[PDB]
PDB file of C-alpha atoms in Angstrom:
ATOM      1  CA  UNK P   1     123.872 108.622 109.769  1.00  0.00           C
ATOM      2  CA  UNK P   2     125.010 105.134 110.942  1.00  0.00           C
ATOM      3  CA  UNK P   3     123.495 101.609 111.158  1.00  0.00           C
ATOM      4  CA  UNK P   4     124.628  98.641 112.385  1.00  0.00           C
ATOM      5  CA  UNK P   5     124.039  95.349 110.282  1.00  0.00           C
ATOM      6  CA  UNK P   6     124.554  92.457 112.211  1.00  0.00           C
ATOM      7  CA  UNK P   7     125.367  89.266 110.432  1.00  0.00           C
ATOM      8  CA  UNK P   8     124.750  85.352 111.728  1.00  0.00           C
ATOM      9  CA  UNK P   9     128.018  84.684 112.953  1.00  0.00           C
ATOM     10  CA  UNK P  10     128.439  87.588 114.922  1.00  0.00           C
ATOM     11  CA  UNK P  11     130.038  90.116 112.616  1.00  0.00           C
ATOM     12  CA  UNK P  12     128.857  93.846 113.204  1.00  0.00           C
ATOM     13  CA  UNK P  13     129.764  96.114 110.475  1.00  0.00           C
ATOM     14  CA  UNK P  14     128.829  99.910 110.309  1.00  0.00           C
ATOM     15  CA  UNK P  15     127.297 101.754 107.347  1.00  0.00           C
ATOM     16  CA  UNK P  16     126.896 105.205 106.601  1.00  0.00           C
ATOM     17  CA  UNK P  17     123.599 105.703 105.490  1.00  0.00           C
ATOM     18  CA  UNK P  18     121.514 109.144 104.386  1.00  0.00           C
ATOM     19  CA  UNK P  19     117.970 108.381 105.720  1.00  0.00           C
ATOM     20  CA  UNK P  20     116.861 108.864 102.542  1.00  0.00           C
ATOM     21  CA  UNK P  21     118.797 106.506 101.437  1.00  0.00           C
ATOM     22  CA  UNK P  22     116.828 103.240  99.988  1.00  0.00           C
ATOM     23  CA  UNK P  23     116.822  99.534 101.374  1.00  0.00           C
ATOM     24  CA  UNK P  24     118.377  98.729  97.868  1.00  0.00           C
ATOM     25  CA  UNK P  25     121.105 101.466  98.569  1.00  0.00           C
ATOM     26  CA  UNK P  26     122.067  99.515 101.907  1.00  0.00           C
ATOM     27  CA  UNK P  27     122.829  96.513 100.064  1.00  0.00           C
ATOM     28  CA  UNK P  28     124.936  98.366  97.451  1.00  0.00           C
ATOM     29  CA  UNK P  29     127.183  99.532 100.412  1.00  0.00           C
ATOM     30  CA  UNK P  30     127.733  96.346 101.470  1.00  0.00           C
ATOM     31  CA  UNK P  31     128.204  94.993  97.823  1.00  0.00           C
ATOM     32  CA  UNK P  32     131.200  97.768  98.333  1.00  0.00           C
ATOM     33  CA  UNK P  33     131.896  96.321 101.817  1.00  0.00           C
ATOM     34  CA  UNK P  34     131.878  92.668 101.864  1.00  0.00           C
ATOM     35  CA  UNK P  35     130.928  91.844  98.411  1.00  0.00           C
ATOM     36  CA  UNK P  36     128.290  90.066  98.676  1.00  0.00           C
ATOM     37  CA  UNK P  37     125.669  90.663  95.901  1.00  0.00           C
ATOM     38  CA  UNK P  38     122.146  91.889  96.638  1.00  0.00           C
ATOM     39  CA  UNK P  39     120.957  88.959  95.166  1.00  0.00           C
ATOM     40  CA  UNK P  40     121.365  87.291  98.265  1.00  0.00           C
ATOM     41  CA  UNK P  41     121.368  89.803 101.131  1.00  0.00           C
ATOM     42  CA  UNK P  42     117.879  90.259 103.077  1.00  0.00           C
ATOM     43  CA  UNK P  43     117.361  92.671 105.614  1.00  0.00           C
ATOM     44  CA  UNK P  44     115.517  92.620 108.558  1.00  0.00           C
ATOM     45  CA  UNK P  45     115.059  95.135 111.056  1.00  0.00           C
ATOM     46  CA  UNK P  46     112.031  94.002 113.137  1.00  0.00           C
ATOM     47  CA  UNK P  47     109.267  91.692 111.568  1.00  0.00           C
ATOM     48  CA  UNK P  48     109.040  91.883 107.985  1.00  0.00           C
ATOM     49  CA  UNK P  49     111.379  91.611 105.238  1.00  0.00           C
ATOM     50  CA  UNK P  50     112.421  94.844 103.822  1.00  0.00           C
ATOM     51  CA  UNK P  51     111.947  96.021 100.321  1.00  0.00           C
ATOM     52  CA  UNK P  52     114.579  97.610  97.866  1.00  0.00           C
ATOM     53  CA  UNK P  53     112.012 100.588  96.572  1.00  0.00           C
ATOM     54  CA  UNK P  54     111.690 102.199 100.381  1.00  0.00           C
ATOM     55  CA  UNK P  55     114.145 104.477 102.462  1.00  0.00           C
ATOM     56  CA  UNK P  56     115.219 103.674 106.185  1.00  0.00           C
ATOM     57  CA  UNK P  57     113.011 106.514 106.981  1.00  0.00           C
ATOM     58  CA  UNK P  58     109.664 104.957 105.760  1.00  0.00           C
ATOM     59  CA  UNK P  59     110.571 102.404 107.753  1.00  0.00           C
ATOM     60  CA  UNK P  60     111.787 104.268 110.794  1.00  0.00           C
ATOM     61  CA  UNK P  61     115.374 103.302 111.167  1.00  0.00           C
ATOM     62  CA  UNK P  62     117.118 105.452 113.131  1.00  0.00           C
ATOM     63  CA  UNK P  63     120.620 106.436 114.192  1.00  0.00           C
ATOM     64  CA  UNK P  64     122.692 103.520 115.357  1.00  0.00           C
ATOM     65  CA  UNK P  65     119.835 101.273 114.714  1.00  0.00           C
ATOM     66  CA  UNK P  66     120.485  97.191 114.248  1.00  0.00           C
ATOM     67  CA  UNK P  67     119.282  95.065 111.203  1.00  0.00           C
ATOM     68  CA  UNK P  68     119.844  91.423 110.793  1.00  0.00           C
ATOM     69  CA  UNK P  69     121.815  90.473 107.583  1.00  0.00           C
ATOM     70  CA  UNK P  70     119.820  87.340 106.277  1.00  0.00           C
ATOM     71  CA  UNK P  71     121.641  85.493 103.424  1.00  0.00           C
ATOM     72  CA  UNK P  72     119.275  84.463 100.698  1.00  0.00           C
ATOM     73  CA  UNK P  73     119.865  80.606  99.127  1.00  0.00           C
ATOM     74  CA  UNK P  74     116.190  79.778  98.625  1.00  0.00           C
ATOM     75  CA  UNK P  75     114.052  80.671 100.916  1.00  0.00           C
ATOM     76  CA  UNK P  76     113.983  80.217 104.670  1.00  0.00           C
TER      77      UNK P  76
END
C-alpha cells in the first residue's frame, strides 16, 4: 500500500507502507529515503500528532492517503 508524505516546500515522496505497519515504521522509511532521523520527523495526517506505537490502520490511513511531514526543532 502507498502514502503520500508531503513535505513544507512542496516535495511529495511515496512510501510503501503495510497497513500494519507502525507510525514509527513510516519514519524509518524515510530515515532510508531522505535521511532524516525520526528524531525530528512529525507526522500529521489530520488533527493530531501521530504516535510511533500505532499502525496507519488504527488511525485509518488509507491507500494513497496524504500526511504532512512536520520537522521537529523544538516545538511549534
Amino acid at each position: 500500500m502507498q502514502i503520500f508524505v508531503k513535505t513544507l516546500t512542496g516535495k511529495t515522496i511515496t512510501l510503501e507502507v503495510e497497513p500494519s505497519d507502525t507510525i514509527e515504521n513510516v519514519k524509518a522509511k524515510i530515515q532510508d529515503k531522505e535521511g532524516i532521523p525520526p528524531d525530528q520527523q512529525r507526522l500529521i495526517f489530520a488533527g493530531k500528532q501521530l504516535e510511533d506505537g500505532r499502525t496507519l490502520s488504527d488511525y485509518n490511513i488509507q491507500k494513497e492517503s496524504t500526511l504532512h511531514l512536520v520537522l521537529r526543532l523544538r516545538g511549534g
